[PDB]
Amino acid sequence: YGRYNCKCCWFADTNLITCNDHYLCLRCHQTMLRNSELCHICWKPLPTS
Amino acid sequence: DEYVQELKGLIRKHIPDRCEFAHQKVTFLSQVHPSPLLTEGFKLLSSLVELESCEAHACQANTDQRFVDVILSDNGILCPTLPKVIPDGFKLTGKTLILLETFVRVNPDEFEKKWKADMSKLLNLKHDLQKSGVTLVPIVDGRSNYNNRFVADWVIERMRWLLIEILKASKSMLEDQEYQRLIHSLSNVKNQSLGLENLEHLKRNSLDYDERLNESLFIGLKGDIRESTVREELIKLKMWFKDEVFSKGLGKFKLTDRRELLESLSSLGAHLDSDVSSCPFCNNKLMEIVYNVTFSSVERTNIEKHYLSVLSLCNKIKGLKVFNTRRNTLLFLDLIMVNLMVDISESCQDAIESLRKSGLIVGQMVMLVNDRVLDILEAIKLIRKKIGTNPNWVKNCSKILERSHPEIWLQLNTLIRQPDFNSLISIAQYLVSDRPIMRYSKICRHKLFQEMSSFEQMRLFKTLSSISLSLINSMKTSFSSRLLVNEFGNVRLRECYAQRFYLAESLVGFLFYQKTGERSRCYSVYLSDNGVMSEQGSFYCDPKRFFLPVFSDEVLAGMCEEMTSWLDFDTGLMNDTGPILRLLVLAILCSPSKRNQTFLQGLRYFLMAFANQIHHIDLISKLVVECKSSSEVVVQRLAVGLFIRLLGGESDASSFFSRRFKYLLNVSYLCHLITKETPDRLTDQIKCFEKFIEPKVKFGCAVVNPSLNGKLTVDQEDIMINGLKKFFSKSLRDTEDVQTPGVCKELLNYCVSLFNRGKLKVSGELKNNPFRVVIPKLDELGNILSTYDKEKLVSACVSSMAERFKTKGRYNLDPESTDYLILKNLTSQEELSLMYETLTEEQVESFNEIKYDVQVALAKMADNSPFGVMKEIRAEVSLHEVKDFDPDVLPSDVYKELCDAVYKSSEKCNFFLEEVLDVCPLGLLLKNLTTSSYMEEEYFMCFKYLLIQGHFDQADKLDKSYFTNAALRNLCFYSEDSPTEFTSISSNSGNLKFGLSYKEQVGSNRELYVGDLNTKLMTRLVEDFSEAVGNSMKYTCLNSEKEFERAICDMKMAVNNGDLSCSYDHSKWGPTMSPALFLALLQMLELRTPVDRSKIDLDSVKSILKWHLHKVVEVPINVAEAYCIGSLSEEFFHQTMQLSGQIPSHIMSVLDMGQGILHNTSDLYGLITEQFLCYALDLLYDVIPVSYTSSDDQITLVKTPSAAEWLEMICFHEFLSSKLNKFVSPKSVIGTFVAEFKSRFFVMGEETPLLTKFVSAALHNVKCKTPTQLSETIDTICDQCIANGVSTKIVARISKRVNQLIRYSGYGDTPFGAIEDQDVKDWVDGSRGYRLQRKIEAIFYDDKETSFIRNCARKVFNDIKRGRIFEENLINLIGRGGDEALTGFLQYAGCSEQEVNRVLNYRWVNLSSFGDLRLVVPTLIKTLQSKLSRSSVASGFIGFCKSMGSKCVRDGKGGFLYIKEVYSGINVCICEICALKPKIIYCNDSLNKVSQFSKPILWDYFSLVLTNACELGEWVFSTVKEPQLNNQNFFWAVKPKVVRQIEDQLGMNHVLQSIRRNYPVLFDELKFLDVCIALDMMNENLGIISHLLKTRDNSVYIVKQSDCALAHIRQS
Ligand SMILES: [Zn+2]
Ligand SMILES: [Zn+2]
């Protein structure tokens, strides 16, 4: 993996979902599923659970 | 005495024709004695060279060599008591006199430092000679060899080849330092080697000054401190530091507290203090005029072209100056124009309403001449007054246009038709409306910009283009253009200038102004709907700063939509931040001020300081600049009112933070749309000087006038040496006095002694050892005629005219042949107006002074009532003259206006004449020339001529005969200025002068020291020494590209890996550091050479930075008289007047190193100290740092073991560096997310593409030579501009602004022209040679006529390749021309005659056929020579529509013609060939009359294809396959992938492949290279060898998925 911060929001540290090739937090995870299911940071699908 | 018998017989072959060589030889032959033979037998060699400069010019040689006061007393002239100078030749006539000096040097270095002394010693003689009433014309002679005519050039070298031995023997057989400068003067032509060993063979005396230096400048440096003692010292220092100064609250950094910044920014930006209104269109004054024009026109003709045709014939008839003045030559064709208007009312029943009120005449108006609206009743009175003055004005000047004249006209009877004054009263009564009013000096209704739909905002910028175009060609109006009627609350506007601009098919606008030229004006803007007038306002702005938006509505409406589509993640956020940003982008261009440039640049530092984790403490008291007006608030509420909107809301506004950073960074850089121009240059040099002196007198080191040669007095010495030991005080353990320049002397000792041993990451092993035209004055830099040249070309013109009418005896001067000379050597009535009007106003105001003093001097050349006391001289005129001296410099602000009318208007007397006499015999220009301004309406210049008329400016000596410093002036070739024995601080000849100038950067103006000519040759030595030492270093990146590329490649991977990476700066790195620091560093280095392991001597460098310790910074002359009139620099002047009151014109100093002199000698100093400080954190905070350097900005990347607990790491890091006068600027910002280096910002995981520096750099810098060269620069800036991925849609709208700047410019269009439209992928694959094929085959849209030339190219190129010869004799087949070479190739490849019949019928009309376009050999040779050997833009585009729409084409015969004349000779050919593409490709039979230009396009197609197959591919040939959605924001990296069918290393082979092509052009000036090098030399538009010796130079292209996958593909 890369650097230990969220790839989206830059200012979080803890409880991070190991996504495809970049971290992601539970705060900004809710604000991606309502647009679509394809991401908008790496453009490959993600796990839901 | 072994050559003494040879010497008298050697020089007997020079005949004493005159009395100047008879007296020399009889005291030469009568002295066989070597003691005067090298004084009296040696002063003859000057006396033969001095006579050459009196036979060429008009002259009488000086045989007595005597004074000037009694050379004016040989004529009967009262004594002026001049200073004592001696001329080497004069010539007097009447009351003018021609001093001519004579001096000769060989090397240039001590030539210009003789010319600058001679010209100053001559021009400090006029001011005492002016008071006697005679003016001078001074000349000098530059000679770089001996080229005498009176001998035959084969015996004078025998002098200096046989007198060079006689003085060595003469002083060996029988005064100290006056010997070898004579040798360096007498010798042969010096192909002299210049290096660091040149300093070694000097004398090196002492001064009893450098000992009190060395008591202060090398003492503490012992330079061999043991490396086991520094560690225990620094542990005590940190143990002092943390317990002492950090915990009691004096640390310099902090933790950013990320809410307190967005409490601070509101009071930073939202100026709730002042009283501006919220509505944006109200406060500004030009946004209002856009809003008033654009809602009066949106919610809502053969006689016209006849009138404009005779108008454009009047424009050609004006520029000849034939009617002996500039008044009745304008009323004359005013009469012509009003007669041609009144000969329209007798035509159709209605025409002056239905076809003229919709066009060129509004109510009570008429348009004519240069640009003047003349408005009929006033015009009617003037003609009646002129015919009242003269009974029959139009009987001879009616047709003086035949004889002594062009005698080609079309005005049938309007020349002679007397305008019936009893007829124009009806027309003057019919159209009557309110007159134009032009202003100087409550509630709102402006419809709330956010409440407009997304179509009626484009109709702001399409009024902004059309108002900006009428602003720009209000520069083109002719710069003399004096009106016919002259002369502040509100002015009703009688007559004034005018420009026009179309909006729709009935209504137009106008633009009214009074002052022509490039300064600020007082404009007014009108509409004309259907005849009705409606005033819509007034504003006050400046013309040439509006060149940014001239045609670029689609550009600046495509990027305010590109930048918005980055925010498709909060849709409600986008639909609000869209219609607030476009108000900002209007608000910048509609008010270009430096301040709302500087402020928007100041937010790329606020923005790193909020993504990072540590910001410097003082920066919020630096991002504020006070609103000097009430217009820089409405911009500073849409910028800050945007950062409050999307940096931080009170909720969790951190959804997608990366695009937020990108879109705020390209709003911080939205700064750059404003033109860097320095709005006025006398208020720029006050700021430049005030930034120069304030870090200097605060510390106390500036002095007044030094000697400029060697010595300093004692009181001047004391301030220098006290500044020296005050610079080095700064004891190590006091936290006060930390913002003070200088070094801690005990810390620098460790810093150099640890460097001696090999423990720093760099170490001094130092491979390949280092020891291997007009030029202006230095007090006014940045200008274009410095004050020395403005008299030198005067004296050249007077000497050229004084000889021309004494060869025959004309004694009359022609008022164009006296303007023919100056206007020639600065840069037949047609040739004058060809090259008069291609100046700038900065030069027109100089050309007037040159014409002025030349005609006054010519009037004085043959020359051999004051009771107008309306206003008494008693207290006015005499005082003004004395205070202002000469009449020429007299001010006009001393009196009222009407007194200039009444004192001029004395009756006719002996002062005047009549019949202004266009031949004008000499001796009358003091009375003829005044009447020409007595009849033209001007008065003031007539007042100056009337005043300058009426007398209103008023044996021991033989031991001294050896060359001593009293015996300097005996010779011209003595070379008095020669370097002979350097001293502790000087060089016995000069003292390293400079001069001041600014650089015009974006935010803050950078100063720049222009240096003299000795100073460059003494600076390049030191600079290449440091380039040699820093070549063997490992961490700088200033000159080497490779290490900079390694630093960027490290920074990418080390941001992504959890580092803590900083981004520093150094505040005033220029004017703080000093050469004495570089001395104290260069004393104790070792630098052991790898060839010979020893300690080299650096004494030739240690004894030349002492020269840079004592520089002489001038003051500019443009600031010494504006501070004299009336601000701590002003106090520095006005306390140095209460000393001895001489002006402070020189500042010897201690601490400057101006930015751009000693540049690489701080590139190492910014590296040694950085490695010391980067060792200070490997040892006291157990990490492993690494610190790069670009001499002004740094980045010290830091790894951490195993998140900002370690402020102690960083706040200590500043605290040592301030001990070495490397300060950390408050612009610095350190954290772990954003980091910068030379403005290339590296955000996490990516790079920010930074869209708005490239488009803002390509909208400007349109430099015009030819309309093919201008489609090279902007094509290249489009090639770089896709490497950061702007779009293609922004790329294809720069490439119609660049096309319509041409299609407006007279040139018309041509199939190459500007670069193409609809470009998608080919920026990745291929240079400019590829895109033209996609442009040409875009015309043939059916693709059925270039298919055959592609098939013939498939026949040819497979045959011309290797393994076969197949006509390698094509070197002569190309040179037949262009039109028939394809007629060879096609029947070579083989077809009928009918194929050539259906191919050669296509022809494109060219303009650079025989010669190329002229406006005042291919480009191949000038392209190769640069591999062989080594003003405001909006006034440099007007010269591309003023000297191009006039005569600029050339034919094969001797001659020139117009462009409209060529396009008038082409017919209409509707039969399907002209109907392919209109106005671009023609038929063959439509080119009958003009038939000598037309090449085919198809030959150019074939030559481009055989160029491209050489350069790449074997796939340019195929027919285009028709192309193949992903998200709009998925951009990714591609590589070029080119297949090149040559072999590389072409650095020399292009030179060896012109012998087979053209031998004499090479005389005077591989496997497949040769067959497509003769396909390049026959035209210009091809460009191979510029693209094969270089490479593609980006190779890392990054593009969108939606604009890299959507494209075509062309496989094989
Ligand atoms: Zn997040
Ligand atoms: Zn993703």
Numbering used by the authors:
A (entry chain B): 34 to 82
B (entry chain A): 2 to 175, 180 to 305, 321 to 461, 468 to 513, 520 to 804, 820 to 874, 886 to 922, 950 to 1039, ...
Sentences copied from the publication:
The arenavirus genome comprises two ambisense RNA segments encoding four viral proteins: immature glycoprotein precursor polyprotein, nucleoprotein (N), large RNA-dependent RNA polymerase (RdRp) (L), and zinc-binding matrix protein (Z). The L protein is a multi-domain, multi-functional protein responsible for transcription and replication of the viral genome. The Z protein is a small but multifunctional protein containing fewer than 100 residues. The Z protein mediates multiple functions through interactions with viral and cellular proteins including negative regulation of viral RNA synthesis, orchestration of virus assembly and budding, and countering host immunity.
In this work, we present the structure of MACV L protein in complex with the Z protein solved by cryo-electron microscopy (cryo-EM). In the monomeric and dimeric MACV L–Z complexes, the stoichiometries of the Z and L proteins were 1:1 and 2:2, respectively. In the MACV L–Z complex, only residues 34–82 of the Z protein are visible, which make up the zinc-binding RING domain. The two zinc fingers, located on opposite sides of RING domain, use conserved C39/C42/C58/C61 and C52/H55/C72/C75 residues to coordinate the two zinc atoms, respectively. In the structure of the MACV L–Z complex, monomeric Z protein serves as a staple, interacting with L at the intersection of the core lobe of the PA-C-like region, the palm domain of the RdRp, and the thumb ring of the PB2-N-like region. Loop 1 of the Z protein contacts the L protein core lobe and the palm domain, while loop 2 interacts with the core lobe and the thumb ring. Residues LPhe642, LAla643, and LPhe689 of the core lobe and LPhe1378, LVal1388, and LMet1389 of the palm domain form a hydrophobic pocket at the interface between the two domains. The side chains of zTrp43 and zPhe44 are inserted into this hydrophobic pocket, just like one end of the staple. From the proposed model, the Z protein in the MACV L–Z complex is proximal to the putative product RNA exit surrounded by the structural elements of core lobe, palm domain and thumb ring, about 37.4 Å from the RdRp catalytic triad that is located in the central cavity. Considering domain rearrangement is needed for sNSV RNA polymerases to perform and coordinate complex catalytic reactions, the Z protein might exert the inhibitory function by locking the multiple domains of L in a catalytically inactive state.
